[PDB]
Every structure is written in C-alpha cells, then in structure tokens.
C-alpha cells in the first residue's frame, strides 16, 4: 500500500517492517540486499521523529542531513545527540589572587554542535566558587563528533573572562585551604549549541535551531548507552517504547541489537567486533544503575537462554560498558603481559573454543609498571566445574588482602572480586587462587574502575 | 536521458558519465571537446552538493558563482574551502606590561572570505596567557585566494586590544620565562567569515552567509592534500566516496587525477607541471601520515604497476606535497651550485631519457650559503642495479656524523637519508657515497624537512 | 532575434555585435548613427554582470543608474568603481602624549560612496602604532566622484578617536623616535561603503547594499589602468576576457580602444586629448609592472605595427600612465621656460608634421625654480637617422653626473634616461647631448617619477 498516516514520504507498511533506501525512495526489505552492504530499518508509523532528533526519519534513513553526523545516527532508532563537555588542562593561580586555567571542549555524541557555549562550576570541595559561563571569546565555531576544540596540535583556550569583569576570590579562605594542597574541580551544568538544517534556497541555516530545545525529548523516549574503551568514550542514545501506551509504536530490539545499532558494530556470525576489540557479552564488562539491575534481573527468570544481550530495550535504562585493558581467552587474544602458571590448552569444552585444564592452583605475578595507581581493579572470570564437589579459594594482595572462597557451578560461572591499589611505590600486586581437582577458566579479563 | 534525481538541472546519465556545459545547458561529453578548452566533469547524481561546499554542481560546472573563485573549483569534486590563517610579524612588549603584536592574515584556499575574524592563542610555552578574538578595528573586509590584509605593500595592523580594552599579562612570572630565552607564539583556533550568495534581485549578498556551517560538512566528505613548493603553499580538499556506503554515488578518482583536478596542473602526455614546475612523483618527495601510508601500503601490493599517483584516493587521506629545493635530473634541470663528481651522461636506462654513468664514488661539496641552518633535510635519489651485487654506503657530515648502508634493487628505487644541520657558523655539509661497481642515478634531489 | 540566454532585456546577438540604446529599447548598431553621437556597445552574452560591477549590461547601457555615476561607466565593459582613499593634511602632538590628525577622503573611481567608514594604519618607521576605524563623527554622508569630504572650501576634519578614547602612543620610545626626526605616516588598508540602487517602489536605497562584496569579483575581471595629469590623478577598471576558458564571451579590445572607453577621451582621426591635452602613445611615457612588461613585449613581435596601443587587452595587467609636464614636440606645444639651443622646423620628416635639423650638440638651461626637488626625473626623445653611422652621447648634470652613449637606429627610436635631482638650494641641472652628424629629434619630454 501507500498509506502515510505520519506524512514523512513513507508508508506505514514499510515502517512496520523492515525497509531501506534506494535511490532517495523507500522500498520493501528482501533478505537478498545484505549482499551489497544494505541496512534494514524500522521506525513507528504513526511519529514523523521517531528518537526524537530535530530530523525526520525519511532524512535519517535517505542521509539528508549535514554530513558530518554519524552514520551511527542514520538509523531512525539512533537520536543524533551531540554529548559536549568540558575538560581542564592546566591551573594558574597568581596575585586579591585572579584564578584561570586552561580548558578544552570535548565532544563524544553522534552529531556537531556550532557555536558551542558550555557553562561550568568551579568547585573546590563542595562549595561552588563561581559559576561561569563561555563568552564571546570562548565560542566553539564547529565542534564535530570524536573531536575537540582547539583541534588536535593547538594549545587549550584560556578561561579568565568574568561576567566584563576578572575572576577574583576575594575570600583568602579559599587560598588558605589550597595551602593545605586542595585542587579546584571544573565541572559542566549546560551547553548550548546549534543544528544544521537547509532552508528553501539551499543553504544551511543554523541561527533559529538549538539543540537545548530536543534535550528534554530526546532524553525522555531513549535509553542511555555508554561504551568506554579505556581511553575513548562514547555515549549514545537509543529510543524505546512506553510500556502502559498502547498507542507508542517503537520497535522493541534486544539490548545486542541495540549495541550494534547504536555504535556500527560488524557481527562476524555471533561475536560482536567494532574496531576489531570484542565487545560480547563474556568479553566485556557491564555496570548497570540499581533500577536496570532490578528490571534485568526480573525479565531473566523468563529467559530460556539466561542471556544478559537478549533482553529487550526499555525506556528510562542506563547501561555503561567497559572494556577491560587486560583481556585474554587462550585462543587468539592474550595481552597479559606475564605468563600464567599451571595452564594447559588441550581441550575442547571451551566457551567458545578450548579452556583452560588447571590441575592444582594457578598464580600469575603481574608488575605494577603497566597499572595506574590510586585507581579501583576488579578480576572476572569464568569457571566451569560438572563435578560440582571442588571448592576454590582466592588470594589476592592489595591494600587490604582479600581471601574468599567459591563454588562453581555445573556450567560456566562468572566471578568477580572488588580490590584497590594504592600508592606507585607500593607491594607489587599478588594474586593467587587454588582449585581442589581439575576446573575450566576461560575469559580472564582485568578492568580498571573508579 | 532527461531524468535528474537529484534537481540540478543536469540529468542522471550525464552526470554518471562525462558531462560538459556549453552555453549554460549541460551537454553529453565528447573526446573531441578537449582540443577546444572544454573539460570533462563527473560527479554524484544524488546529492546536488557533491563536495559539500555551498554552491551545486551546476553553479560549479557552468560557472554562475563569484568569479574571486579560482578555476580551479569550477570541479564539482574540488571544495572551494577557504584556509585562512593569521601570521605574527613583529612583538612589541613595554611597560605592567603591554603587549603589541603586529599580524597579518594569510588565505590558501580557492574562495574569498569576506568578514574575516580570526580568534588567536597567545602561548608562551605550553601556557596560554590569553585568548583573542578581533574587534571591528581588525576585521579585514576582503580576503582574495593568494591575498593579505593588509596587502602587500601596507604595514601589518596593530592586534592589541581586547574586548575598547588593553591587553596584559596579569603578572610578571610570563615576563620571568620571557627574558629567559622564551618566545610567545601565534596559533589560529578558528576563523569566522561570509561567502557570497545571489539573490533574486541579482545583488550578491553575504550578511547572514557564513562559512562556519558548511566546515564541518566539507572536512567530513573531503580528502586533505597541500602542496609545499619552499615559497607558496596550497591547500585543497577533494571530494571522495565513503567505502562502506552503497547508497553514495561519488565518483572514484586516483591520486594523481586528484593532484591533476585540485591544482589544475597541466598534463603533457606523462608528465603533471603546476606552473611549470614539475609534480611528478618521482620529482618531488610525498610526506603520508600514519593512516594514509599504510593505507597506500595495503593497495599498492594488489597493482601490477606499483605507482602512489596510481592509488583511488580515499575519504579522510592526508597526502602533503614537498617540492625538493635543489631537483637535478641530468636531461633539462640541473639547480645544484656545485656540480656532481664522475658523472657520464652516455646511457639510455634513464627514467625519463638518460641516468648517471657512475664508476667509482661520487662526492659533492655543496655550498653552505644556499642551505638554511637549524633544518633537517632528507635527500632522495632513485637507484638501479641489475647486477644485484654492489653494496652502496653514505657517509654525510653533520651534527651526529652518519655511517649507513643501502643493498640496491635489480630496478629503480627511491631512498631516504636524514640528517639534522645546526649551527649558521657550523662546519661545511659533506656527503660521500661509495659504489663498488657500476650504478645507474637518476633525479637526485634534496628536500627540506622540519625541525 | 529575440533570444536572450542571459535575459538582460538584450538578444545575444546584439551583444555579439555593436548595439546602442536608442529610446530604452536596445537596437542593431548602425554605421550611421555615429554622426548622431550615439556610441557602439559590445558586452558578453553569457553573463547579466559582464564586468562585475553591481549594475547589469542594460542599466549600465541605458544610464538608469544614478546620475553621480560618470558617464565612463555607462560602458558596460568598464565597471563602476570608488577608488578612495584618506590623505593627511595636518599632524598635531600635544601632551602620555596625544596625537591627532586632519584628514580629507579622496575619491577617483567613477561612482559615489555613501558611508564612507575608512580604516587606517598608523605607522612612523615600519612599525605599525595602532589601526583605527571611523567612528560616527568622522562618517561621510556622501563622496561623488573626483570630490572630496569635507568638500572643497572646508577644513579638513578630525580623527583623535582611537576606538571613544584618545589616541595614545603607548611607550616613550614613540616621543624617542620622535626626537630623531621621524616622521608619522598615514596609510588607508580598506575602506567600507554603500552602493546606490532603486528599490521595487522608486527610492533609491543604500542601507543593504555594500561595496565590499563586488571588489574581489571586479578585481579578477578586470585589469587596472591609471591615468596622471600632473595633479589629478584617475582610476578605471576594464573587463577583459579570460584566456582558456571557451564560455568567456567577454569582447576583446585594444590598449588604446581600452584607454578611449576607461577615460572617455576624444577621438579628432588618430590623435587622443582627454580634456585638451595629448595623451597619446608617442606623447606619455606608459609606467608598467613586470607581467604587463613580458606579456607586452612577447605581444609585440607577433604584431607587424610594434605598438603598445595595438596590443590585446588581457586579465591582470596593470597600466600607470604619467602625463608629461614639460614636453615639446616643435609643433603647438613648447612648455620649457628657456628655449631650445640648434633647433630647425624647417623639416617634413616629423612624428605628426615636423622634424627638428639638428646639426651639431644641443644644450638646454633648465631653471630649477619650476623643479621639484628630492625628485626623480626622466628625459624621453624620439631620434631617427637614416645615416645609422652617428654615436651620441648625453651629459646630464645631478647629484651624481652621468654621460652615456646612444645609438640612433634608421628609424624613430624612443630613449629614456633616469636621474635624480636633490637640494633646492643646490647645482643647475644641466642637460648637453652631442650628434656626430645631422639627426631628426621630436616629441622631447620631461617628467615627475617617484621620490
Ligand atoms: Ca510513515
Ligand atoms: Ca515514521
Ligand atoms: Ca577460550
Ligand atoms: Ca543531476
Ligand atoms: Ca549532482
Ligand atoms: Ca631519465
Ligand atoms: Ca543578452
Ligand atoms: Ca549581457
Ligand atoms: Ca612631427
């Protein structure tokens, strides 16, 4: 049929099902278009903004919006949300004393944002100094995804301008407890920022536009996803529907599909690869808030495959993902830099491929060279014991050491162990665990934590 | 046919083909065309802005835009992007302190700016005292492609106000650092300025234009290449596909047809000339970052001819063109102010038309006077050997002395040597080189690098 | 016909050929409407703006423009241009210390400029002190051509304002420089102004309409030529045609068709008087920049009449034009307060009617009451001598004395000689050159160079 109830040069047939763009034209989806690279979308027949985003989905899904958005944010799913921060290089304190420092504007969202006037707080320890916002002189022309202003290879901006007037801690106080060596935090409330949308001539206007008038949209029909790789972070936000409603059409996907959609992430089969570093489930790290901890752990009583990536999306979760920096799974990836002990590659029961055949009890020596002090580790694993009659007990040097026992399940079991490392010039860091016969581990990762 | 999809007025089956505009209506292109000026033109028949600038394919093609843009990005696939960037030229410091700079704006693009408005950084080292923003008594009106406000011949404006304000460093540990052997640098954040549009009533208009929303767009569809001939400099973008996409329609260009369309070189035959001087590649040394080197690196063992230029530029490539200073080929250039040692120009193996005869060892004793110290330099020759059995070592004077080895190909190879020259009242540069047998060179070259 | 590709109310066809404007309809130019005083215009069919300017072909050709625009630009090749600048004419330090200066703007283009908003530089030796826009005191209201502001009669007005805040040498090394005899300069880097056009309803509106956006487009379609009367000085700007480009319909004149239409000069058969006053080739000395000199002088061989006013117009040139002050030609012009030494008219063999028999050396004593000292001067004559067999040589008295040989060729030869005189209260300039044998010597001229 050709029905538009939405009017947004789609039919409501093609947007219940799958359907994808050919030649600025929407046509119904056939499982033979994978081969020359298409995608399949799916959007609500009745919402002409499905993820809220200022762009239509026939201009998400055809590519008619500026072009430096993502085409992670092509899908109608994906709302084109630009994530600006602030981050702080350097602190100068001079002579009562003036205070400015050095900043940087960050962005790790999925669209630009022109004319970029971020607002900070500077806050030493709970009290709020004074609350600055960006001038005529610390405006951010362009600002385009996974970039920064000034740009790579440019000094950051000074931040002095007050009010115009200087910033002046009047109070000594203030100076007195920075004597004691207190640091002075700069932390971002609101950004303000335009779109670029093309007027009848052509061009690209983006003087009327703002994205502070899709924040509050966006965040209230979509789900917060934020993948952190050890040193590049990303957030991103995916829609979902309303649960009492039963006029919300949005697509309900699985918290997987969801991934793959939201960061591009080619699927070889199972696995779930986005720059070559697996992002699975078992090999990788997820933190969730107390609400989607509740929600996961309610909706997996009904799951036959106990998975934590196929549970279906809902509005209001938060997930956060964390790459560990040390991964390994005897099969084609180990990063450790010191050899294992008692380790033996002859199997075939393995999660994916073979495990590891301890017999006895494994103790790795790893140096403190490569580990950032000061920071919070946590050690994941998966054992698998049929016999279910082996008890295995770990030990673990930190701060404080830790000593606790475990008790592996017929199938693969997930461990995870909380410890803190304190101090450069410290005990190097020991770690032993002991195994009563013969267990299975496979997927020892290390994740660096708060 | 007479199907556009993409409604700028040029069907589709031209534009996937050859097309032409002849008298203001895009025509079907035809070989015989080019023996009268005409050129061919292709371009992507979705998008009616296939480079993302703000003019269409039309406008580009037929030439219906402001006529301050070079020729040049008269190409739908060439970005008229203007690069504009601020140069220091004096520093006036005095009793605290003011500071007075005089600067003046330098453009390399193929647009004008009008309304220009750098923001600067003033570093000193590392730290940056303060940034600025030009008031209206710095905003130069008009900036044309090549041109300066002030122009040549006028003496750069005073840049030393802040918001009807004074400019100051709010004590004196900067001035501590300055007197100590530091020097404040110069450094463009960004720049804002207008480009010119056309309105019904015909007047060109360029109050609310501004180049700030089509940056963005440009550097994300673009390739980056420069060109560096040791006076000016030139910086193009050039449109090109996304891999990944099947729905994108850009067409796919090689590097040396990029190079070819950007700079409008003229192309005899073989050989590119930008103004007569030559670009060829093996002619002038090509500086790659990291991606783009190893990207080359992955598709030039898939080509039976093994040729850079030959390489289908890709979206996101940075390619820098160095011009070697002193070029000597043996056949029409030879710029070298000392002459080479045991050279034969009887042979016939040559790249172009001959090489050098050598039988023995070559030595040169170039002048110190044309060379600019506190540089690295990097020289470059092209080497073949069929007998695979002479081994080649350098011996070059410098700040660290260098002893190498090189092991020759059966054909012809380019290399590399670096060296660091410090010191204007510094020993004269040697350079030695050894052949045990008999050696064939050819465009020896010497380039200069950065510090 | 009645085909109008560019719809400028003129078929392509007419514009292809002569055309003239007789009763706001355009009409087939005719050989006979000459008499009538009507003139032949020719523009490009392919543009609505054939030289840039922000008036179209028909407004241009039918004079619906405003009147303050001169009749020169009613040519729809020569473009409208306000050339102004800022003279200074007083310079006042009182006390740091305070400084203002008296200035009056300048206009020699051929169009009005209202809110004229100058920006000027302020340097005293190389250094540049401040830059300074007008503020709404120092705003012209209006500026026709060849006029001034304040108008003549008028002192001149004042510009103290820095941004309002006084100026303000910012060191004492200023009043250090100062004691040195160093001299403050006053130079205009750009100038911001309004055009003139009539609205849908009647009036004429100049609020939106700037002249910044058509002076880098009339810059590159264009070539600048300049003409000097000795004390007024005129600007013009004439299209010319792009050199490979097939679709540039843009007419091609000569230097001297080029020049008629610029400056609007009279044509008595072959002879050119701007207002009364000989401006031909064999009566100026044409002042060139470099690419004007090689385009020419390559031109010049493949032309069998060898004369600057027959070569083809072409994009860039520029052309600077110096009228003679003392100049005689022995015919109706003789301007030099003491008379000539061995002078003949008794001859048929001159450049227009006669020739001078010079039998012997020719001296002349110059006054220097009527010499500009500080000054450069050139001394230019025409020499013929069929004989070819006759050395001369010239004695010119100057700071330093300078004696050198010429070689008469068969036919008119223009020489020049360049010297410079320095000191009112110093040596007569004496001039003596010396013929072997009898020679022909016409169009003899003196005239100003730069200081
Ligand atoms: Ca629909
Ligand atoms: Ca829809
Ligand atoms: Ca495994
Ligand atoms: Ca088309
Ligand atoms: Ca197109
Ligand atoms: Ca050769
Ligand atoms: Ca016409
Ligand atoms: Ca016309
Ligand atoms: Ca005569």
């Given at each position: 049929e050709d029905l538009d109830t939405d009017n947004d040069n789609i039919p409501d047939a093609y947007e219940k099902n799958g359907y994808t763009i050919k030649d600025s034209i929407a046509v119904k989806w056939n499982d033979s278009f994978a081969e020359q690279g298409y995608k399949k979308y799916v959007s609500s027949y009745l919402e002409s903004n499905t993820a809220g985003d200022p762009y239509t989905d026939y201009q998400k899904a055809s590519g008619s919006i500026d072009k430096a958005i993502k085409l992670e944010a092509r899908d109608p799913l994906v709302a084109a949300y630009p994530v600006v921060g602030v981050g702080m290089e350097n602190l100068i304190i001079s002579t009562s004393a003036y205070i400015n420092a050095n900043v940087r504007y960050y962005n790790t969202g999925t669209a630009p944002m022109y004319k970029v006037t971020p607002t900070t707080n500077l806050v030493?320890?709970?009290?709020?100094l004074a609350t600055i916002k960006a001038q005529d002189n610390q405006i951010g022309n362009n600002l385009s995804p996974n970039?920064?202003?000034?740009?790579?290879?440019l000094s950051p901006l000074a931040l002095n301008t007050m009010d115009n007037a200087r910033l002046i801690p009047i109070n000594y106080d203030q100076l007195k407890k920075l004597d004691s060596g207190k640091q002075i935090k700069l932390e971002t409330t609101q950004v303000s920022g335009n779109y670029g949308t093309k007027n009848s001539q052509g061009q690209i206007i983006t003087?009327?536009?703002?994205?502070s008038n899709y924040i509050s949209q966006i965040d209230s029909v979509s789900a917060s996803i934020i993948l952190d790789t050890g040193s590049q972070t990303f957030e991103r936000r995916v829609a979902a529907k309303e649960q009492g409603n039963p006029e919300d059409k949005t697509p309900e996907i699985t918290i997987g599909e969801a991934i793959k959609k939201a960061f591009s992430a080619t699927k070889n089969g199972e696995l779930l690869y986005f720059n070559g570093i697996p992002i699975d489930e078992s090999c990788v790290e997820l933190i969730f808030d107390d609400n989607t901890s509740e929600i996961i752990k309610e909706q997996l009583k009904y799951l036959?495959?106990?998975?934590?990536?196929?549970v279906k999306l809902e509005r209001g979760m938060n997930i956060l993902i964390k790459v560990p920096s040390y991964f390994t799974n005897f099969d084609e990836y180990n990063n450790f830099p010191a050899s294992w002990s008692n380790?033996?590659?002859?199997?075939?029961?393995?999660?994916?491929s073979v495990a590891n055949k301890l017999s006895g009890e494994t103790k790795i020596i790893i140096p403190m060279s490569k580990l950032k002090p000061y920071k919070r580790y946590v050690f994941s694993g998966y054992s698998k014991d049929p016999s279910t009659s082996n008890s295995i007990t770990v030990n673990i040097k930190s701060k404080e050491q830790k000593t606790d026992y475990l008790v592996p399940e017929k199938d693969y079991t997930k461990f995870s162990y909380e410890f803190e490392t304190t101090g450069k010039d410290s005990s190097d860091i020991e770690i032993t665990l002991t195994s009563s016969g013969v267990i299975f581990l496979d997927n020892l990762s290390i994740t660096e934590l708060n």
């Open positions: 030493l320890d709970g009290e709020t970039e920064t202003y000034p740009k790579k290879g003087e009327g536009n703002s994205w036959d495959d106990k998975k934590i990536y196929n380790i033996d590659t002859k199997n075939q029961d393995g999660l994916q």
